[PDB]
Each structure stands twice: as structure tokens, then as C-alpha cells.
Amino acid sequence: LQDVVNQNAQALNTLVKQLSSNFGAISSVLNDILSRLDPPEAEVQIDRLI
Amino acid sequence: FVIRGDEVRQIAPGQTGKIADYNYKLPDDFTGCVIAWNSNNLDSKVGGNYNYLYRLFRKNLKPFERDISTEIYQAGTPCNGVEGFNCYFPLQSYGFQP
Amino acid sequence: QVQLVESGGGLVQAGGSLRLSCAASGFPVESENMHWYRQAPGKEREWVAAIYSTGGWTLYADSVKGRFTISRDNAKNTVYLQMNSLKPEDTAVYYCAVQVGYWYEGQGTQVTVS
């Protein structure tokens, strides 16, 4: 039971950590990307993050 | 329409610029194209050709709009529709010369 | 026959006040956007002003801030140009150019500063 709980917790934590990865983009937060870049390039970055 | 040399790059979808934001807007999903040809023998005259005008001051345009109104632009004491401080003319001419 | 006649030019002292006039007949003036044409000895011909359709919308060059005043006779399609606070280097010859198709410009008029 402890192993199952730990696996679920680490899977959720891994998902949350992966949520904050650049994936080859300028930044890991889309607000900063929108504030910095232009419509087309920011759209490309958002598509890669997506 | 008629534009200048460096204005060609601004006539394109997704390209930023003063003219590309206040005069003519191309949609992000634009389908079509642009044919530009030099008219130095027709639109240019000795002494300066000033028939062609472009908006200079504006608060943004969505794709494919026409803004024929050129009401005076307020930059922030308001001048109340009179040329003076904190407000300048919204249109500017090109002044093409040979 | 579409023609231009010039009026108002002549010798003047700095600081005067007069009417300058280009009278043309045979076509409407609100049809398009005319401009004005100045000649002085130098590099090339030098622009002054032009007004546009749908309102006066008078535009002046950077060296002519707030001096020329224009009163405008819409009933009988006539120009009136009105000069203020004259200083010397603008000794020139004046034309008024309009568009109805072919390129058109008249004979002009002489203006001097003493």
C-alpha cells in the first residue's frame, strides 16, 4: 500500500515538474513569452510547449 | 495602395511595425499574396510628390479594417480637438523625390 | 480647355499680407487632392503645402510652421492663400498642381523679398 501511494504521489509530482519544462522554448511561462515575442513566433513557441 | 521601399517588409502577415499596426493589417491566417512594382516614373515628381498619406498616430487595428476617420489623437491636459500640445496630426506624407 | 491663371505675385516687403490665387475652370476641385509647387535657385524644387478632400486637412512643411492661412471659396471653386510674417530666403516662383488625369501645371507667378 505504501508503494502504491508513493508511486501515485511521484507520478503526480513528475507531471507537475514536467509542466515547468521549456521543451525547447524561450521560457517555461507563456505570459512572459507573450509579453516578449510577436504573434507568429510566440504562437510557434506556444505550439511547441503545447 | 502605394508604399515606400522599407514598407514592403511591413506588408506581410505576422510582421510588426508602425505602419503594419496602424494603417494596414494582415490576418495571421491570411491566404493570398502581394504584388509590388516600382513606380518611380509615375508616383514620383521633381519637387516632391505628397499625394500619398499614411496614418502616424493611433491608440491598433484588427485584420482587414478601414479607418477613414482621422480625428486628432490625444497623447495624454487634453487639447479638445485643437492642434497644440499633447496632440499631433495623425497623418504624415511620404515626400517621394526622384 | 483646362487652364491655369495666376494672380497676386509681385514685389513685397517682409511682414506683409496679401491674397495669392490660382484660378482654374472646366473641372471640379473637390474631385481630388491638389498641391503647391515652389521654385527657388538651388538643388531641386521645394514643397510647401497641400490640402485634401473630406475636410480642409491642411499640411505644411517643417519650415513653415503656422504662418500660411488659407481661406477657401467652395461656391466658385477658388483658392485663397494668405501670407503672414515673411522672412527673406523664400524668394520663389509659385505653381499650383492638380490631378484630373494627365499631369498639369501652369505658368506660375513671381514672389520676391526686399
From Swiss-Prot, chain A:
**What outcome is documented for mutating Q7H in this protein?**
In strain: Omicron/BA.1, Omicron/BA.2, Omicron/BA.2.12.1, Omicron/BA.2.75, Omicron/BA.4, Omicron/BA.5, Omicron/BQ.1.1, Omicron/XBB.1.5, Omicron/EG.5.1
Q: What is the effect of changing S35A?
A: In strain: Alpha/B.1.1.7
Task: Report the superkingdom from the record.
Answer: Viruses
| Entry coiled-coil feature ranges | 2-46
State the protein's purpose: Subunit of the fusion protein that is processed upon entry into the host cell. Mediates fusion of the virion and cellular membranes by functioning as a class I viral fusion protein. Contains a viral fusion peptide that is unmasked after S2 cleavage. This cleavage can occur at the cell membrane by host TMPRSS2 or during endocytosis by host CSTL. In either case, this triggers an extensive and irreversible conformational change that leads to fusion of the viral envelope with the cellular cytoplasmic membrane, releasing viral genomic RNA into the host cell cytoplasm.
Q: What is this protein called?
A: Spike protein S2'
The record's gene field reads: S
Swiss-Prot record, chain B:
Assembly information from the UniProt record:
Binds to host ACE2. RBD also interacts with the N-linked glycan on 'Asn-90' of ACE2. Cleavage of S generates a polybasic C-terminal sequence on S1 that binds to host Neuropilin-1 (NRP1) and Neuropilin-2 (NRP2) receptors. Interacts with host integrin alpha-5/beta-1 (ITGA5:ITGB1) and with ACE2 in complex with integrin alpha-5/beta-1 (ITGA5:ITGB1). May interact via cytoplasmic c-terminus with M protein. May interact (via N-terminus) with host bilirubin and biliverdin, thereby preventing antibody binding to the SARS-CoV-2 spike NTD via an allosteric mechanism.
Result of changing E83Q: In strain: Kappa/B.1.617.1
Q: Where are the stretches annotated Integrin-binding motif? A: 4-6
From the UniProt entry, list the residue stretches annotated as the region Disordered: 56-89
| Mutagenesis or variant effect for L53R | In strain: Delta/B.1.617.2, Epsilon/B.1.427/B.1.429, Kappa/B.1.617.1, Lambda/C.37, 19B/501Y, Omicron/BA.4, Omicron/BA.5, Omicron/BQ.1.1; Contributes to cellular immunity evasion and increases infectivity
State the encoding gene: S
So what does mutating K18N actually do? In strain: Beta/B.1.351, Omicron/BA.1, Omicron/BA.2, Omicron/BA.2.12.1, Omicron/BA.2.75, Omicron/BA.4, Omicron/BA.5, Omicron/BQ.1.1, Omicron/XBB.1.5, Omicron/EG.5.1; May enhance affinity to human ACE2 receptor
Result of altering E83A: In strain: Omicron/BA.1, Omicron/BA.2, Omicron/BA.2.12.1, Omicron/BA.2.75, Omicron/BA.4, Omicron/BA.5, Omicron/BQ.1.1, Omicron/XBB.1.5, Omicron/EG.5.1
Give the result of N41K, as annotated: In strain: Omicron/BA.1, Omicron/BA.2, Omicron/BA.2.12.1, Omicron/BA.2.75, Omicron/BA.4, Omicron/BA.5, Omicron/BQ.1.1, Omicron/XBB.1.5, Omicron/EG.5.1
Q: What is the effect of changing F85V?
A: In strain: Omicron/BA.4, Omicron/BA.5, Omicron/BQ.1.1
Q: Which domain of life is it from?
A: Viruses
Task: Give the function comment from the record.
Answer: Attaches the virion to the cell membrane by interacting with host receptor, initiating the infection. The major receptor is host ACE2. When S2/S2' has been cleaved, binding to the receptor triggers direct fusion at the cell membrane. When S2/S2' has not been cleaved, binding to the receptor results in internalization of the virus by endocytosis using host TFRC and GRM2 and leading to fusion of the virion membrane with the host endosomal membrane. Alternatively, may use NRP1/NRP2 and integrin as entry receptors.
Tell me the outcome of changing D6N.
In strain: Omicron/BA.2, Omicron/BA.2.12.1, Omicron/BA.2.75, Omicron/BA.4, Omicron/BA.5, Omicron/BQ.1.1, Omicron/XBB.1.5, Omicron/EG.5.1; complete loss of interaction with host integrins
Mutating F57L has which effect? In strain: Omicron/EG.5.1
Q: What is the effect of changing Y54F?
A: In strain: B.1.1.298
Impact noted for substituting V82A: Increased resistance to neutralizing antibodies
The consequence of R9S is: In strain: Omicron/BA.2, Omicron/BA.2.12.1, Omicron/BA.2.75, Omicron/BA.4, Omicron/BA.5, Omicron/BQ.1.1, Omicron/XBB.1.5, Omicron/EG.5.1
**Which residues of the full-length protein are shown here?**
400 to 499 of 1273
Q: Where is this region: Receptor-binding motif?
A: 38-98
Q: What is the effect of changing E83D?
A: Increased replication in human TMEM106B overexpressing cells
List every stretch annotated Immunodominant HLA epitope recognized by the CD8+: 49-57
Which cysteines are disulphide-bonded? C79-C87
Protein name per Swiss-Prot or TrEMBL:
Spike protein S1
